[PDB]
Amino acid sequence: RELTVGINGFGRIGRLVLRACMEKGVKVVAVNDPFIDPEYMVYMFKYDSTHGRYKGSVEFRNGQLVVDNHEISVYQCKEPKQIPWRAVGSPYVVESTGVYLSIQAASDHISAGAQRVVISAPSPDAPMFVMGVNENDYNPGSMNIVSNASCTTNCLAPLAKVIHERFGIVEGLMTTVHSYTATQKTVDGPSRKAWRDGRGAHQNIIPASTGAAKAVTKVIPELKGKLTGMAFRVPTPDVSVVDLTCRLAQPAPYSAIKEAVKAAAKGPMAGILAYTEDEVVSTDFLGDTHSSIFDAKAGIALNDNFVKLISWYDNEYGYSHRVVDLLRYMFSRDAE
Amino acid sequence: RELTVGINGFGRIGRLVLRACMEKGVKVVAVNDPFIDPEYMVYMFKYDSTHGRYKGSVEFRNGQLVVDNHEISVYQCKEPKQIPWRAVGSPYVVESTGVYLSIQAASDHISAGAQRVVISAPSPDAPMFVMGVNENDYNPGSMNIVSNASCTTNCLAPLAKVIHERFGIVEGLMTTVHSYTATQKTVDGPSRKAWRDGRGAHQNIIPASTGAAKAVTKVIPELKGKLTGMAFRVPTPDVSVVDLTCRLAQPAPYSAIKEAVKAAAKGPMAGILAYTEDEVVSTDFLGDTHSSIFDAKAGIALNDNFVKLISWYDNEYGYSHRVVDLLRYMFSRDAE
Amino acid sequence: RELTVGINGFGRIGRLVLRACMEKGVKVVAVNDPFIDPEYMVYMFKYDSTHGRYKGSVEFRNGQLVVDNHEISVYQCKEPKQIPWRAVGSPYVVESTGVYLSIQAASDHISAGAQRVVISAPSPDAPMFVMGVNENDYNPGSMNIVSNASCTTNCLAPLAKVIHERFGIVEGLMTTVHSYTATQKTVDGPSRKAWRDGRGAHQNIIPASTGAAKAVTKVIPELKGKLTGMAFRVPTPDVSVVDLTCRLAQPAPYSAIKEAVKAAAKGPMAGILAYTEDEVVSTDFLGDTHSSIFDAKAGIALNDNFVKLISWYDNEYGYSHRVVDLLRYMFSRDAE
Amino acid sequence: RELTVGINGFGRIGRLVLRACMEKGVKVVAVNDPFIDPEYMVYMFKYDSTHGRYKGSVEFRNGQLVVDNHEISVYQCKEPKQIPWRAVGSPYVVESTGVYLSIQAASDHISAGAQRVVISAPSPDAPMFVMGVNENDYNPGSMNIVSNASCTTNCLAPLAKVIHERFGIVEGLMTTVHSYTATQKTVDGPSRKAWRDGRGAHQNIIPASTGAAKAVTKVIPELKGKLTGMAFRVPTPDVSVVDLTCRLAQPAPYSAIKEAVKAAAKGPMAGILAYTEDEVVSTDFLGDTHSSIFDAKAGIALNDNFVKLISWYDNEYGYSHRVVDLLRYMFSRDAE
């Protein structure tokens, strides 16, 4: 009768998704990771450089991870096919390894026992959702596997939706100034598919490709062809900011832009898109659970039709919470 | 008969302008700074965290700073009026303290003995120059005091000039992702005129106002009303990047944008604007003496009329060299 | 009938002492700072890059700072002698500006109506106290102005006491590997009294003098002449670590060293000195309220009489809580 | 008739040993790395975030790496035994991958045709050499595989020798305050063998084990049992500093300590051990080719027999130059 969750991979998104589940009362029945044994999972979950010590209890005993006295099964399978998901009640599975992105690859979870799969990363072919934008397009019959898109897409789409629906977006170009991540290197090292991403992450501003802005045009079809962008990786370990430069159809004096965002944040997009007029900086959004926080004082307009809009996101914490939100939402629709 | 230079202030721009003078064979006859005595000036000039040890010799003896066996007079005057510029041959003076920006304030140098003044910072009323863009607008009779604009304006204007003259700029919005500076704080401290700039510089992405993009519309009058922008201060100690989002009149497929920049870099803007197709990151421009380095692979286009252009600058080193370039240029025009 | 506290200075220690007071239920009745008005105080207090958003409510009204609905008077006096401590009931005053350190300088607070003064920094002549080590030597009858020593002294002294009393320290040399602070510079800038300290804090490992080890011999007299030390400032914004290399008189196999510290932490020094065997790093102590956290696994012994002991401290947060603890203790003794 | 060098591994030490070879005029005839092709080698070699652009020319052609017009063969073999060292004239081989450290593992290079092997890292069994300390113990007749020890061993050993020989070391404990390296992580990630080392390198001060101090007792036998140590990894990308706390046998006032190091640096250890009295910080040693730079002003003495001595090293650049120096020395002795 209840929503139960299994997590594949115990990287940053895996661990932070478990925190978000504990916060929101969602029961996690198991974690799979081939390289991290239970006693080490305890340590990695407990201590976090970015988000502080876990605010409950974390122990292991009897080969089990134990979080707030909830016992969590631990497997060590190298391949999704091997995971005894049936042995833990066929949970919804979060697929967070970053290496099984296609519907096909992910589907090994289903063969193994998983009721649904949320891929915590963009997917080439799996259907893609952004809470607050298009979750009511989830089709429980035909969708056994979904993607929660990217952290960056989750920041941008709520905002794009609001601006477009109010003023119409003729065209826009996005920069995200983004914290470095686990895919980067501490000092100049090998990154043969993307040379810049090898260069030392703490020393450099690193230009990087991203599909995030374009992905927005998939969860918001009417923006097809009107959005793209790029990224600069900078030396901060978490929190990122969207810089959307857009041409708007209807006149859009900045006061009306502020009132539109405010109304969305107070109403339909509450808990997803937030609004602030404070003199904020990136660390003020560490631990923020919103997908997108509009920075009113930071944006600039050239005129009533050409504007730069600024929105923050905790690229780790916002997105992890949205994965749990998606799971909960899906579960409330799969009982039909 | 020769160009001689005096420097007021021995902050980063003061010290780096002296390096650029030594590099380019320009004779500096004196430095003024009330707080930094000669023996300490030796130390600060010799050792640099960002640009390495001075590659010549630096000593003091007989109350004098001595650089490469060129003896440099040192004064300790708190006010520009007091500086015996006549005592050192009425040099051209670089005014680099950041606190005498108006024609009026700066003119105290002239009362004190200075032939011309270059203000190494934007000025509200003083005439403003960007080498490669508008230096042939310098009027030797009426201009006793000029500003070399900002580091950021020197990055953007060469590029704007090229793009506008080739394709026409309808409108553009600029972000600079910029290294932190001396005006910032190591940890959250007081910045009552601009609250965000108080927050710890190494920990944060900090949105900030800048007049740089607008300043471009002053050295390039035909762009009046068509450019503005803003800044993010990020945790790197030097090198910054311009992200210009612009709508162009003439069609501007990216290949033609690349060919226009390349032609300018190879020709009229050689030594000012450079062009690269390498997989570069910010540290690859430490010590670069160009005002502006176009990053061909980093830019993105939505279509032939809406594009994001990326250009790097060593915000300390490029600008310091341009100050020396301005001085040399002015001197070659004041003998008329 | 109850402790009330005035705080001179709203720098990092002033703001974080105010947090500690709210956490421990100590009434603060005024803050003085000539440069920071109430509205800006709200902002500086509410948002912290290191320690996060204040967990509670912060507003201004009626020229007052209001924290969790407790109203706090705000004065703007440049000098202690001018602050109307009498008008707010003659509280205990925390002198946190770092420029009134002698009994003579700090006594201007007394002459302005302060009941007592705690200097949140080493004093050349005021009596010095480390909670857990020597607070029992405070005497209300003879002492109206006291020093809470430094953050570093508060980390080493509790460890030195445990170790001296159990084994006897023959001699010891300390290094502290220490986060940068507000006295440092974002980029190479002026620091005429200590040239290294002007070099860019986030770029460098910076050797510095410190009297913290010698200060321990002031609060633990029997160690007179047996301890000194030095510091390295490194590119982290908070949390620091003591590295004590000492020769011990009695045999001291590491297992006994461990049982002695553990014993002190569970009993007489509980809340002051903590003990851990986990694989900790500096961020694991952000927000830690202990003065000193012994890291059992990080230390190393050459032999039974020559060992290197490692202890962590949040140099901001531990010290601030100790300031409040000394205030409460002093008040509990002033009822005599 | 001349030294030729093959390099296995094009990681940081491989690339910087190649730089050192070009600077010192040592012919490199091949590089092996299974993962990095010639075109990517050109890029990794040409641009360096820490040490700047290669000062010279770098190209690829004909499946070769070409540096300052010297052609260098490139192999892509996963195993030493497979590299055709014979085909390039049986050079001396630098084993720089860090995973062939035993005589047995490194001897596969010999079986593949290498004349000699220098392991650029500590070896469990191969003979270990520090230039300036014990290179005189190398013997071509018995030794075809050698270790150049570690960066840290090369900083401490030259200082320990000078101090032991002048004063006698009774006992010593070392800390190295050390830049992060490629074995570390940008954000909390996996490190199952050393849990601390997986924690985010730029966020943390990280305690670590090191055998560097004990290794000094291998190259200076008379110090057997008299030295051990540990490390803190801190958020800088290069340059590190040894902090030696030692008890000395003969009286050793600091002025004599200073004259002993100065004497060694001007004479027998010139180019290996340097001496400075300036107010230096870590960035002042970027690109320094010494093994060890004694910092006179940073050290402190408790008394004539118990002192803390501080020495700097560029852990990348000094060590790399030492690898080349050992190669040249070995070759000068193989003509016997």
PDB file of C-alpha atoms in Angstrom, chain D residues 65-240:
ATOM      1  CA  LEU D  65      54.873  14.592 -30.027  1.00  0.00           C
ATOM      2  CA  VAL D  66      57.164  17.435 -31.131  1.00  0.00           C
ATOM      3  CA  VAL D  67      58.531  19.769 -28.486  1.00  0.00           C
ATOM      4  CA  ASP D  68      60.876  22.630 -29.548  1.00  0.00           C
ATOM      5  CA  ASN D  69      61.265  20.683 -32.823  1.00  0.00           C
ATOM      6  CA  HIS D  70      62.571  17.611 -31.060  1.00  0.00           C
ATOM      7  CA  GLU D  71      60.513  14.620 -32.148  1.00  0.00           C
ATOM      8  CA  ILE D  72      59.263  12.242 -29.438  1.00  0.00           C
ATOM      9  CA  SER D  73      57.756   8.813 -30.122  1.00  0.00           C
ATOM     10  CA  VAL D  74      54.388   8.085 -28.532  1.00  0.00           C
ATOM     11  CA  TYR D  75      53.323   4.606 -27.403  1.00  0.00           C
ATOM     12  CA  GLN D  76      49.941   3.547 -26.076  1.00  0.00           C
ATOM     13  CA  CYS D  77      50.767   0.373 -24.148  1.00  0.00           C
ATOM     14  CA  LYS D  78      48.840  -0.631 -21.078  1.00  0.00           C
ATOM     15  CA  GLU D  79      51.780  -2.633 -19.672  1.00  0.00           C
ATOM     16  CA  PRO D  80      55.530  -1.829 -19.194  1.00  0.00           C
ATOM     17  CA  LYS D  81      56.551  -5.249 -20.607  1.00  0.00           C
ATOM     18  CA  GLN D  82      54.884  -4.197 -23.905  1.00  0.00           C
ATOM     19  CA  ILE D  83      56.552  -0.799 -24.425  1.00  0.00           C
ATOM     20  CA  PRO D  84      59.164  -1.132 -27.232  1.00  0.00           C
ATOM     21  CA  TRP D  85      61.958   0.632 -25.355  1.00  0.00           C
ATOM     22  CA  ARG D  86      64.428  -1.244 -27.660  1.00  0.00           C
ATOM     23  CA  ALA D  87      62.963   0.452 -30.738  1.00  0.00           C
ATOM     24  CA  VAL D  88      63.914   3.855 -29.342  1.00  0.00           C
ATOM     25  CA  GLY D  89      67.432   2.950 -28.314  1.00  0.00           C
ATOM     26  CA  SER D  90      67.066   1.489 -24.847  1.00  0.00           C
ATOM     27  CA  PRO D  91      66.888   4.741 -22.862  1.00  0.00           C
ATOM     28  CA  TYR D  92      66.769   5.297 -19.127  1.00  0.00           C
ATOM     29  CA  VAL D  93      63.083   5.046 -18.164  1.00  0.00           C
ATOM     30  CA  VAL D  94      61.173   7.175 -15.675  1.00  0.00           C
ATOM     31  CA  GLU D  95      58.434   5.044 -14.211  1.00  0.00           C
ATOM     32  CA  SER D  96      55.859   7.774 -13.286  1.00  0.00           C
ATOM     33  CA  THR D  97      52.449   6.025 -13.147  1.00  0.00           C
ATOM     34  CA  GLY D  98      52.702   5.181  -9.446  1.00  0.00           C
ATOM     35  CA  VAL D  99      51.518   1.589  -9.923  1.00  0.00           C
ATOM     36  CA  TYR D 100      54.853  -0.153 -10.666  1.00  0.00           C
ATOM     37  CA  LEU D 101      56.792   0.535  -7.470  1.00  0.00           C
ATOM     38  CA  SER D 102      58.563  -2.704  -6.550  1.00  0.00           C
ATOM     39  CA  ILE D 103      61.766  -3.903  -8.194  1.00  0.00           C
ATOM     40  CA  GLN D 104      59.711  -6.833  -9.568  1.00  0.00           C
ATOM     41  CA  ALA D 105      57.044  -4.610 -11.155  1.00  0.00           C
ATOM     42  CA  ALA D 106      59.485  -2.028 -12.518  1.00  0.00           C
ATOM     43  CA  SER D 107      61.810  -4.712 -13.906  1.00  0.00           C
ATOM     44  CA  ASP D 108      59.303  -5.310 -16.703  1.00  0.00           C
ATOM     45  CA  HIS D 109      60.744  -2.089 -18.212  1.00  0.00           C
ATOM     46  CA  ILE D 110      64.194  -3.682 -18.090  1.00  0.00           C
ATOM     47  CA  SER D 111      62.856  -6.810 -19.782  1.00  0.00           C
ATOM     48  CA  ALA D 112      61.332  -4.500 -22.396  1.00  0.00           C
ATOM     49  CA  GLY D 113      64.772  -2.989 -23.085  1.00  0.00           C
ATOM     50  CA  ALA D 114      65.188  -0.084 -20.676  1.00  0.00           C
ATOM     51  CA  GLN D 115      68.827   0.444 -19.645  1.00  0.00           C
ATOM     52  CA  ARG D 116      67.788   1.658 -16.168  1.00  0.00           C
ATOM     53  CA  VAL D 117      64.615   2.646 -14.306  1.00  0.00           C
ATOM     54  CA  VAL D 118      63.936   5.585 -12.012  1.00  0.00           C
ATOM     55  CA  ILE D 119      60.690   5.140 -10.093  1.00  0.00           C
ATOM     56  CA  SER D 120      59.376   8.707  -9.456  1.00  0.00           C
ATOM     57  CA  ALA D 121      57.900   7.658  -6.104  1.00  0.00           C
ATOM     58  CA  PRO D 122      58.814   5.715  -2.972  1.00  0.00           C
ATOM     59  CA  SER D 123      59.559   2.020  -3.501  1.00  0.00           C
ATOM     60  CA  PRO D 124      58.989  -0.745  -0.970  1.00  0.00           C
ATOM     61  CA  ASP D 125      62.328  -2.404  -1.942  1.00  0.00           C
ATOM     62  CA  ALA D 126      64.234  -0.455  -4.666  1.00  0.00           C
ATOM     63  CA  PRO D 127      67.249   1.579  -3.543  1.00  0.00           C
ATOM     64  CA  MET D 128      66.208   5.144  -2.681  1.00  0.00           C
ATOM     65  CA  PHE D 129      68.128   8.330  -3.524  1.00  0.00           C
ATOM     66  CA  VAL D 130      67.916  12.006  -2.583  1.00  0.00           C
ATOM     67  CA  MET D 131      70.205  14.257  -4.616  1.00  0.00           C
ATOM     68  CA  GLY D 132      72.470  16.151  -2.207  1.00  0.00           C
ATOM     69  CA  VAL D 133      72.077  13.499   0.506  1.00  0.00           C
ATOM     70  CA  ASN D 134      73.131  10.018  -0.742  1.00  0.00           C
ATOM     71  CA  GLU D 135      73.444   9.823  -4.548  1.00  0.00           C
ATOM     72  CA  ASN D 136      77.076   8.831  -4.016  1.00  0.00           C
ATOM     73  CA  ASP D 137      75.667   5.375  -2.909  1.00  0.00           C
ATOM     74  CA  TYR D 138      74.329   4.605  -6.372  1.00  0.00           C
ATOM     75  CA  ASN D 139      76.305   1.830  -8.090  1.00  0.00           C
ATOM     76  CA  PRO D 140      75.713   0.989 -11.742  1.00  0.00           C
ATOM     77  CA  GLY D 141      77.170  -2.464 -11.194  1.00  0.00           C
ATOM     78  CA  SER D 142      74.419  -3.627  -8.817  1.00  0.00           C
ATOM     79  CA  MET D 143      71.528  -1.216  -9.476  1.00  0.00           C
ATOM     80  CA  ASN D 144      69.323  -1.072 -12.561  1.00  0.00           C
ATOM     81  CA  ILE D 145      66.128   0.055 -10.765  1.00  0.00           C
ATOM     82  CA  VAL D 146      66.066   2.959  -8.310  1.00  0.00           C
ATOM     83  CA  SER D 147      63.594   5.260  -6.518  1.00  0.00           C
ATOM     84  CA  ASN D 148      63.880   9.024  -6.259  1.00  0.00           C
ATOM     85  CA  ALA D 149      61.811   8.888  -3.021  1.00  0.00           C
ATOM     86  CA  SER D 150      58.952  11.440  -2.603  1.00  0.00           C
ATOM     87  CA  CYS D 151      58.675  15.213  -2.963  1.00  0.00           C
ATOM     88  CA  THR D 152      58.386  15.481   0.826  1.00  0.00           C
ATOM     89  CA  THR D 153      61.390  13.206   1.482  1.00  0.00           C
ATOM     90  CA  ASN D 154      63.407  15.360  -0.866  1.00  0.00           C
ATOM     91  CA  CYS D 155      62.435  18.497   1.153  1.00  0.00           C
ATOM     92  CA  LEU D 156      63.182  17.041   4.637  1.00  0.00           C
ATOM     93  CA  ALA D 157      66.278  14.866   3.934  1.00  0.00           C
ATOM     94  CA  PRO D 158      68.621  17.679   2.880  1.00  0.00           C
ATOM     95  CA  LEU D 159      67.610  19.759   5.890  1.00  0.00           C
ATOM     96  CA  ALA D 160      67.878  16.734   8.262  1.00  0.00           C
ATOM     97  CA  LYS D 161      71.376  15.964   7.014  1.00  0.00           C
ATOM     98  CA  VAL D 162      72.669  19.491   7.563  1.00  0.00           C
ATOM     99  CA  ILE D 163      71.135  19.619  11.035  1.00  0.00           C
ATOM    100  CA  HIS D 164      72.129  16.112  12.133  1.00  0.00           C
ATOM    101  CA  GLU D 165      75.718  16.607  10.976  1.00  0.00           C
ATOM    102  CA  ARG D 166      76.071  20.010  12.623  1.00  0.00           C
ATOM    103  CA  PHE D 167      74.141  19.383  15.869  1.00  0.00           C
ATOM    104  CA  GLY D 168      72.953  15.810  15.968  1.00  0.00           C
ATOM    105  CA  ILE D 169      69.264  15.024  15.890  1.00  0.00           C
ATOM    106  CA  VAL D 170      68.024  13.125  18.946  1.00  0.00           C
ATOM    107  CA  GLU D 171      64.433  12.840  17.835  1.00  0.00           C
ATOM    108  CA  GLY D 172      62.113  14.666  15.413  1.00  0.00           C
ATOM    109  CA  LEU D 173      58.479  14.724  14.354  1.00  0.00           C
ATOM    110  CA  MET D 174      57.387  16.231  11.039  1.00  0.00           C
ATOM    111  CA  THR D 175      54.213  17.730   9.706  1.00  0.00           C
ATOM    112  CA  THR D 176      53.867  18.636   6.080  1.00  0.00           C
ATOM    113  CA  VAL D 177      51.271  21.187   5.165  1.00  0.00           C
ATOM    114  CA  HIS D 178      50.679  20.017   1.683  1.00  0.00           C
ATOM    115  CA  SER D 179      48.842  21.098  -1.475  1.00  0.00           C
ATOM    116  CA  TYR D 180      46.148  18.784  -2.726  1.00  0.00           C
ATOM    117  CA  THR D 181      46.973  16.360  -5.548  1.00  0.00           C
ATOM    118  CA  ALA D 182      45.376  14.254  -8.258  1.00  0.00           C
ATOM    119  CA  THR D 183      44.608  11.393  -5.873  1.00  0.00           C
ATOM    120  CA  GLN D 184      42.088  13.628  -4.118  1.00  0.00           C
ATOM    121  CA  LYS D 185      38.444  14.499  -4.972  1.00  0.00           C
ATOM    122  CA  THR D 186      36.749  17.728  -5.983  1.00  0.00           C
ATOM    123  CA  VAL D 187      33.663  16.882  -3.812  1.00  0.00           C
ATOM    124  CA  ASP D 188      33.098  14.128  -1.212  1.00  0.00           C
ATOM    125  CA  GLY D 189      33.617  10.957  -3.182  1.00  0.00           C
ATOM    126  CA  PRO D 190      34.929   7.399  -2.898  1.00  0.00           C
ATOM    127  CA  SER D 191      38.250   6.499  -1.313  1.00  0.00           C
ATOM    128  CA  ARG D 192      37.683   3.127   0.281  1.00  0.00           C
ATOM    129  CA  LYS D 193      41.333   2.737   1.369  1.00  0.00           C
ATOM    130  CA  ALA D 194      41.664   6.139   3.101  1.00  0.00           C
ATOM    131  CA  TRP D 195      38.318   7.624   3.945  1.00  0.00           C
ATOM    132  CA  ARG D 196      39.570  11.164   4.652  1.00  0.00           C
ATOM    133  CA  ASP D 197      41.178  11.385   1.282  1.00  0.00           C
ATOM    134  CA  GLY D 198      37.834  11.141  -0.440  1.00  0.00           C
ATOM    135  CA  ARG D 199      36.515  14.285   1.238  1.00  0.00           C
ATOM    136  CA  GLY D 200      36.388  17.431  -0.934  1.00  0.00           C
ATOM    137  CA  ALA D 201      39.930  18.711  -1.373  1.00  0.00           C
ATOM    138  CA  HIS D 202      39.196  22.420  -1.709  1.00  0.00           C
ATOM    139  CA  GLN D 203      36.741  22.558   1.168  1.00  0.00           C
ATOM    140  CA  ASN D 204      38.888  20.787   3.736  1.00  0.00           C
ATOM    141  CA  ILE D 205      41.955  20.551   5.850  1.00  0.00           C
ATOM    142  CA  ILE D 206      42.554  16.788   5.618  1.00  0.00           C
ATOM    143  CA  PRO D 207      44.904  14.805   7.927  1.00  0.00           C
ATOM    144  CA  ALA D 208      46.851  12.091   6.031  1.00  0.00           C
ATOM    145  CA  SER D 209      49.513   9.467   6.693  1.00  0.00           C
ATOM    146  CA  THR D 210      52.853   9.791   4.987  1.00  0.00           C
ATOM    147  CA  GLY D 211      56.016   7.695   5.159  1.00  0.00           C
ATOM    148  CA  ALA D 212      58.204  10.568   4.004  1.00  0.00           C
ATOM    149  CA  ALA D 213      59.840  11.220   7.380  1.00  0.00           C
ATOM    150  CA  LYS D 214      60.653   7.541   7.945  1.00  0.00           C
ATOM    151  CA  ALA D 215      62.014   7.399   4.396  1.00  0.00           C
ATOM    152  CA  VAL D 216      64.580  10.001   5.401  1.00  0.00           C
ATOM    153  CA  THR D 217      65.954   7.405   7.898  1.00  0.00           C
ATOM    154  CA  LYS D 218      66.492   5.044   4.913  1.00  0.00           C
ATOM    155  CA  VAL D 219      68.756   7.474   3.043  1.00  0.00           C
ATOM    156  CA  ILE D 220      70.363   8.742   6.283  1.00  0.00           C
ATOM    157  CA  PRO D 221      70.857   5.429   8.218  1.00  0.00           C
ATOM    158  CA  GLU D 222      72.188   7.033  11.375  1.00  0.00           C
ATOM    159  CA  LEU D 223      68.665   8.493  11.855  1.00  0.00           C
ATOM    160  CA  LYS D 224      67.034   5.044  12.002  1.00  0.00           C
ATOM    161  CA  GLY D 225      64.212   5.194  14.572  1.00  0.00           C
ATOM    162  CA  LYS D 226      64.616   8.968  15.170  1.00  0.00           C
ATOM    163  CA  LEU D 227      62.007  10.420  12.769  1.00  0.00           C
ATOM    164  CA  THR D 228      58.411   9.988  11.738  1.00  0.00           C
ATOM    165  CA  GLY D 229      55.614  12.331  10.637  1.00  0.00           C
ATOM    166  CA  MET D 230      52.209  13.033   9.115  1.00  0.00           C
ATOM    167  CA  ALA D 231      50.508  15.438   6.665  1.00  0.00           C
ATOM    168  CA  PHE D 232      47.680  17.912   6.335  1.00  0.00           C
ATOM    169  CA  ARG D 233      46.277  18.347   2.837  1.00  0.00           C
ATOM    170  CA  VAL D 234      45.036  21.927   2.444  1.00  0.00           C
ATOM    171  CA  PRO D 235      43.225  23.835  -0.322  1.00  0.00           C
ATOM    172  CA  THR D 236      46.169  24.936  -2.495  1.00  0.00           C
ATOM    173  CA  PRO D 237      47.050  23.389  -5.863  1.00  0.00           C
ATOM    174  CA  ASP D 238      50.832  23.371  -5.503  1.00  0.00           C
ATOM    175  CA  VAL D 239      53.701  24.098  -3.086  1.00  0.00           C
ATOM    176  CA  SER D 240      53.976  22.552   0.335  1.00  0.00           C
TER     177      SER D 240
END
